[PDB]
Amino acid sequence: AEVKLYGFWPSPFSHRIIWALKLKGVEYEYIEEDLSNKSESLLKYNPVYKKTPVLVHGDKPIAESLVILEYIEETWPENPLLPKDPYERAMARFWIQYGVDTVAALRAFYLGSGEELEKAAKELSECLKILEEQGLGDKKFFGGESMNLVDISYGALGYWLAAVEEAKGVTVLKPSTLPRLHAWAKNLDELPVVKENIPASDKMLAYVTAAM
């Protein structure tokens, strides 16, 4: 208790938060929101955006996943999910901001069909190549030898992108073209903190298919 999380079951934005709380050992009450029938609590706690997720700590709300993650890191500092050095912290924030570009590429892919899909797939691959070569490099995690907030932010490139790829019949994140990023996503997907806190594959595929 004392910590509440208003979430949406299939959303990586919500999953990210769960992962961070679990890595911090913070107990939370999870509240599932029906996005088509938003609770009064949700509208009250996030009047600007009226979206999930929303973390409430001591009756005070924090909205926007990226902001919530930073708040969790600063509020429960043990087991740091950001490094100490300002330059390395800036590189973490830089690659989290590149997540904006990645989300856009993922969106185009998710929405494409025909020639559009082919183009989107290609642009997503190019987006991920930059992330792999210049962000991840030869490190096991974006955080080096353990996960940091960048790993959390990109974790959806495993289970979630995999479900979208199955839905579209097109794989973008594949070992032959992105061997380091594919290995990273597979290793993250096998970590208990991730594996225990994502939806079952069938449910995840069923959701993204329906949405399409």
Ligand X SMILES: N[C@@H](CCC(=O)N[C@@H](CS)C(=O)NCC(=O)O)C(=O)O
Q: Please tell me whether residue 13 binds ligand X under the rule CB under 6 A.
A: yes
64/166 with CB nearer ligand X: 64
Q: Which strands make up the sheet holding 3-7, listed edge to edge?
A: 29-32, 3-7, 54-57, 60-63
Q: How far apart are CA 175 and CA 183, in angstroms?
A: 7
Give the dihedral of Cα atoms 142, 144, 145, 148; nearest 10 deg. -50
- CB-wise, 4 or 51, nearer to ligand X? 51
Q: Total residues at the site for ligand X (CB under 6 A)?
A: 10
Residue 51 in contact with ligand X, rule: CB under 6 A: yes
Distance of closest approach, residue 15 Cβ to ligand X, in angstroms: 10
**Does 102 engage in binding with ligand X (CB under 6 A)?**
no
Amino acid, single-letter form, for residue 55: L
Name the residue nearer to ligand X (CB basis): 75 or 134. Answer: 75
What are the strands, taking DSSP E only, across 53-204?
A: 54-57, 60-63
Q: Which two tokens stand for residue 178?
A: 């992105």
Cis peptide before 12 (omega within 30 of 0): no
Binding residue per annotation — 38?
yes
How many angstroms separate the CA atoms of 21 and 55, rounded? Answer: 10
Which listed range, 51-59, 77-85, 90-98, 131-139, lies at the site for ligand X (CB under 6 A)? 51-59
Q: Which of 27, 35, 133, 203 binds ligand X (CB under 6 A)?
A: 35
- The only residue of 8, 9, 30, 207 in contact with ligand X, by rule CB under 6 A: 8
Residue 104 or 122: the one with the smaller Cβ distance to ligand X is: 104
9 near ligand X, rule: CB under 6 A: no
Inter-residue contact 189 to 158 (CB < 8 Å): yes
Residue 52 marked ligand-binding: yes
Asked if residue 212 binds ligand X (CB under 6 A), the reply is no
Residues flagged as binding site for glutathione:
11, 38, 52, 65
